[PDB]
Each structure stands twice: as C-alpha cells, then as structure tokens.
Structure 1
Amino acid sequence: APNPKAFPLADAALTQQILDVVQQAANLRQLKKGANEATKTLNRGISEFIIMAADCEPIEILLHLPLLCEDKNVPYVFVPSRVALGRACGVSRPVIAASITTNDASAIKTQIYAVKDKIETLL
C-alpha cells in the first residue's frame, strides 16, 4: 500500500539511456562518482542530475540524498544494479551513487539534456 522507499525506479530502456550517458560522461570527466562525491556536488551546486543504485545493502546509505535533491530541484533516479552501474561508470568496485555535473562545454550536452528531461517526465 505504501510506495517503497526506492520509488522511482526506471524500466530497462531508461536504464540503457542512463547508463550509456553515464559512461560517456565518465570518459569525458564531467562526472563525480561516489556517494560522498554526489552529496558534495549537490552541496556545491554544480550538479546536472543524480543517478544511484537500488540494490546496495543497505539501501539507506544513499536513500539519504534525494532529500537534498528535492530541496535543491535536481532530479534523481534509481537504477536496479550497483554492479551494472559500476561496470558502466568505469571503476573497479560496485558503485551506488554518481552525479553528472554542470558544464555547457560538454560534447554530450544535448544527450544529457534529453535524458534529464526524460527523468523529469518519469517524475
């Protein structure tokens, strides 16, 4: 009867767009990857939006964060696998949270804006 503390969570197609954009972002260094990295971007006000995983044990480590996101008006998503997110963000251990940062000098600009608007529509 209550929505779970993870809602929203994306369908597989939107998973694909999110992870691909994340990968290109990590290859072009517009990306702060790591839970504390994410919280500190949110604080510093330089975040395009926030991805995070919904299978880490426990879930509450990163469930803290969307509170900041809702207050600051930045969108957030839960992808269903820290393992997949890690393999797609290009580091060695499973990753449970990442933040795509602002900068318009970004060769993936239109890609990220379209995907962000998709997320906003999800909400």
Structure 2
Amino acid sequence: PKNPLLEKRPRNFGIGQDIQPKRNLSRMVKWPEYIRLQRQKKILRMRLKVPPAIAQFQYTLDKNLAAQAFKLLNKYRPETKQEKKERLLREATAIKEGKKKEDVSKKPYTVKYGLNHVVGLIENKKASLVLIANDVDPIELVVFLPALCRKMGIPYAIIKGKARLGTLVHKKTAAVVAITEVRSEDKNELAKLISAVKEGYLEKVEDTRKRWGGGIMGFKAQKREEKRKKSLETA
C-alpha cells in the first residue's frame, strides 16, 4: 500500500501560471560564428542554382558498388615504410652478392594516386578506372576530371570520401585514385568492377549530370508558396 502522506502537485504551464519547464531549445541556440558559417554555407549552396559541372558531384556510387570497389582496391595499397625498408635491405643484399635488384624484386602493382600523376595517366590513356572524391575543396582541382575521362574513354566514378581514398593510399586525404593494371588473379575482378561501374553508375547519371543543381527552397518559403497556390486554386 502506498503512503497516504504522498501527494501529487501538478504544474500548469499555461500563460501566467507556473514557471515554464526546461525544454530543448537547440533550434534557437546562439551558435558560434564558425558553426553558423558552415551551416549557412551549406544552405546557400542549396538555395542558389548550381551549374552542372559542379552539380554532377552530388551523384555518387551507392553503398554496394563502393564496397566492391574498395574490396578490389584494398588489395593494391602502396608500400608501407617498413615494407620498403625490408625490400631495400633485400636489394642491398643482392647488390652485395653481385645481383641486380630486379632479381630479388618483382614488378609492383599499386593503386595510383596524386592528382597530377593521375591526370597524366588519364591523358596517356593508361588508367583503367578512375575514382574521384566528391568533396574536394577547391572544387576546380577535379571539376574537369569527368570531362577529361569522357574524352579519353576512361571509366570513372565519383565516390564519397577523400578521407576514404586516403585510407587506400596511406594518407589523410586523396582527391583521386586510379587503377592502371592489376595482377592476373584480380584481372577478372577488375573487369567485372569496370562493367559494373559503366552499367550502374555512368548510364544512370548520363542524363542527370547535365542538369542544374540547387534551387531548393527553404521550409517556411515552401509552406508559404503551398499556401499561396492553395488560396489561388480555391479563389
């Protein structure tokens, strides 16, 4: 049995009654200027009309195709410092016993990276697959890359994460990665990935890459125009 001395003291939160309870006021928080600036920058890029060469970067690989591309490319990460030190020790041993370094070292296969290097490979038509980060700032560094790849007939895809590409190439960020050639046991996987990129990314973005982006209205303005159109239709 409950104690008879326990009492309920409900509070009325109407106007002029008891003090208002502490609510979530995060929508009305006075933010620091850097937070307010980055949010407003994103909003302004949504509100203005975006030319197609920039707006094409909103169309990226889906989760499955990005995971398959990373599954292939994670077998071709560049040499670490320890691995290079061990290789150089073995080559120094071969030179000491009077052998060429190519006798103890095989031809490497790596993911190609560095923007100038990859642009050179595309222009020489050596790249077989090009992956471009969607968030390179300044955007001008990669804004010509889909046009260049289309002119050279190279399969490309826009993928989310310069940091994600940096994890491939042992860096913090990477603007672009390319595959030129792989090993014989992964040639079939690369060809299947290239066909998947062509049929599931490039054909699907063939029309949407030519459109203008942005021009989205804010919430209150959208509701205002909906109410205005409803009133015009009613009257």
Question: Is TM (by shorter chain) over 0.5?
Answer: yes
How would you bin the TM-score normalised by the shorter chain?
0.7 to 0.9
Of 22, 35, 38, the match for 2:118: 38
Matches within 5 A, 1:1-123: 4-6=55-57, 8-26=59-77, 29-87=109-167, 89-102=168-181, 105-121=183-199, 122-123=201-202
CA RMSD of aligned residues (A): 2.1
- In 2, Cα distance between equivalents of 1:106 and 1:30: 14
Contact persistence 2:112–2:178 (CA under 8 A): yes
Shift of 1:77: 0.7
Contact persistence 1:10–1:79 (CA under 8 A): yes
Give the structure 1 partner of residue 226 of structure 2: none
Contact persistence 2:165–2:177 (CA under 8 A): no
Shift of 1:116: 0.5
Could you tell me which runs of 5 or more consecutive residues in structure 1 were left unpaired when the two chains were aligned. Answer: none
Q: TM-score, normalised by structure 1?
A: 0.85
Could you tell me which runs of 5 or more consecutive residues in structure 2 were left unpaired when the two chains were aligned. Answer: 1-48, 79-107, 203-235
Contact persistence 1:37–1:99 (CA under 8 A): no
Residue 74 of structure 1 aligns with an amino acid whose one-letter code is: I
Q: Where does structure 1 differ by over 6 angstroms across 4 or more consecutive aligned residues?
A: none
Shift of the 60–19 alpha-carbon distance from structure 1 to 2, 3 Å rule, reads farther
- Relative to total residues, which structure has the larger strand share, 1 or 2? 1
